[PDB]
Write a protein that binds this DNA or RNA. Structure first.
Ligand SMILES: [Mg+2]
Ligand SMILES: [Mg+2]
Lengths: 307, 177
DNA sequence: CATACAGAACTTATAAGATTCCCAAA
DNA sequence: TTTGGGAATCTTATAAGTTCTGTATGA
């Protein structure tokens, strides 16, 4: 009695779970969500592309409930799906099934993403001086991501570029004498990970926050540190991050989109005297009409447009 | 009250001109008409005052966008009707109706969107992987609000100006507290 | 070959209508 | 097959912030 397009959908759900190497209990939850989804007319009668992304949606909802750090972009890459089609289908099905879906777990994403960075062993592309301890890396990156969240750098942004910037800063700060000459682009390349476009901005924001924190400590404030010289004091700054963040807010610390120069415009006044019932003169309308000469010049121009 | 009045940014209205229209004739004989029937079925028309855009269909139905007040929207829709009349069509002004109203303002303090999505979960949708704003679906009045970390708020879906004011007054203590 | 700036996609509401697409009962 | 019921495509406006193009200017 179960439809064919439904059977194909349920099979696709199980295959995606298996490919993603998800714990065994997730497959059953995701299958149940697709079945619950198919009971609604708008889903049953869904088109070719929405039917395909629906599989991914049900797997992502299941992952989000278990704090499995699967991003929307990563699921769309796997499925060769359009992010926007996935985006509208996800929002629709959550609303439809009346679910409260937990947000992406950042701590879980740091552990997973950071572990994929190929920096824990020396190779032709990774010199021995650039090799870092996995646990030291994860621990420092997690502290910098928590600092980014606390200092308004995470809210409204893509989460992965924050972790890229924080990983780089964690790595550099663990051996600063030899790693400050290496750029964010070179770091991603040796770690064999793609460079997200916003990672550069997140990096500069994170270095700016670490400088504001450095100003709360007398012995660091007298050093007149810059974005380059602050890197070797990151270990110290993270050790007292709770105290220094409390101190920095006490003395201005706002989301980066707020710290912008005010815009100068002359149409700010909203005063209008329009009633909607005023006379419409003939002269006011005639300016929107072509003259017989304009009509004739235009007609001639369109009479030669073909052959 | 907050002491903050949301500013109207856009008004969408509709009107029936009560007669069938030849869009090729309008596109040819008007200066302010854009018509690409392979891209979109309607004539796109623009008037300078009130600065607006209209979508004129062969059925005689019209959509008027861009006005900053309901009065400006009515005045503009009436001017488009008059342009159609002078082009030779027996145009009327039937069933003028405001379809949508967009308001905007600033609470001038930052918003922890990650906290608001937890406390007001049943109304909130916040997915930073997709869009920077929290989508707040207020039930009374039936208004969608887009809430940004900056404290800037977009209010939309209103049929009357009072629903924009009512929704912002309801949201302000939620954002303040 | 640096970076800098413009423009547009994403999100929300909303109407218009031809046309496609996908499922349902008859 | 025929009809019906939806949802989507194209387009218009507008605020908001982020992401990511495509282009252009001083070396
Ligand atoms: Mg419509
Ligand atoms: Mg904008």
């Amino acid at each position: 009695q179960v439809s064919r397009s439904q059977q194909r959908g349920l099979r696709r759900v199980r295959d995606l779970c298996r490919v993603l190497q998800l714990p065994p209990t997730f497959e059953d939850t995701a299958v149940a969500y697709y079945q619950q989804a198919y009971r609604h007319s708008g889903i049953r009668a869904a088109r070719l592309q929405k039917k395909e992304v629906l599989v991914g949606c049900c797997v992502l909802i299941t992952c989000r409930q278990h704090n499995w750090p699967l991003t929307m972009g990563a699921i769309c890459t796997l499925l060769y799906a359009d992010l926007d089609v996935f985006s509208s289908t996800y929002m629709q099905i959550v609303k439809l099934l009346g679910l409260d879906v937990p947000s992406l777990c950042l701590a879980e994403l740091v552990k997973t993403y950071c572990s994929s960075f190929k920096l824990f062993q020396a190779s032709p592309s990774v010199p021995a001086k650039y090799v870092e301890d996995k646990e030291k890396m994860l621990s420092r990156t997690m502290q910098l991501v928590e600092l980014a969240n606390e200092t308004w750098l995470v809210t409204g942004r893509h989460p992965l570029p924050v972790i890229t910037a924080a990983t780089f800063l964690a790595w550099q700060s663990l051996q600063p004498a030899d790693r400050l000459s290496c750029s964010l682009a070179r770091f991603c390349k040796l770690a064999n990970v793609d460079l997200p476009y916003p990672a550069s901005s997140r990096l500069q924001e994170l270095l700016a926050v670490l400088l504001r924190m450095a100003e709360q400590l007398a012995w660091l404030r007298v050093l007149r540190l810059d974005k380059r010289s602050v890197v070797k004091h990151i270990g110290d700054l993270l050790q007292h991050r709770q105290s220094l963040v409390r101190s920095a807010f006490r003395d201005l610390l706002l989301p980066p989109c707020m710290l912008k120069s005010p815009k100068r415009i002359c149409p700010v006044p909203p005063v209008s005297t329009v009633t909607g019932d005023e006379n419409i003169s003939d002269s006011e309308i005639e300016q929107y009409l072509r003259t017989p000469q304009e009509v004739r010049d235009f007609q001639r121009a369109q009479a030669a447009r073909q052959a | 009250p907050s002491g903050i009045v949301p500013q109207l940014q856009n008004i969408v209205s509709t009107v029936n001109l009560g007669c069938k229209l030849d869009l090729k004739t309008i596109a040819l004989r008007a200066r302010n008409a854009e018509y690409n029937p392979k891209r979109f079925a309607a004539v796109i028309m623009r008037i300078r005052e009130p600065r607006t855009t209209a979508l004129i269909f062969s059925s005689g139905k019209m959509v008027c966008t861009g006005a900053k007040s309901e009065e400006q929207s009515r005045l503009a829709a009436r001017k488009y009707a008059r342009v159609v009349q002078k082009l030779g069509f027996p145009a009327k002004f039937l069933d003028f109706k405001i379809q949508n109203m967009v308001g905007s303002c600033d609470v001038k303090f930052p918003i922890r969107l990650e906290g608001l999505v937890l406390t007001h979960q049943q109304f909130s949708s916040y997915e930073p992987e997709l869009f920077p704003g929290l989508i707040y679906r207020m039930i009374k009045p039936r208004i969608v609000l887009l809430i940004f970390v900056s404290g800037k708020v977009v209010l939309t879906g209103a049929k009357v100006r009072a629903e924009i004011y009512e929704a912002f007054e309801n949201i302000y203590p939620i954002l303040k507290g």
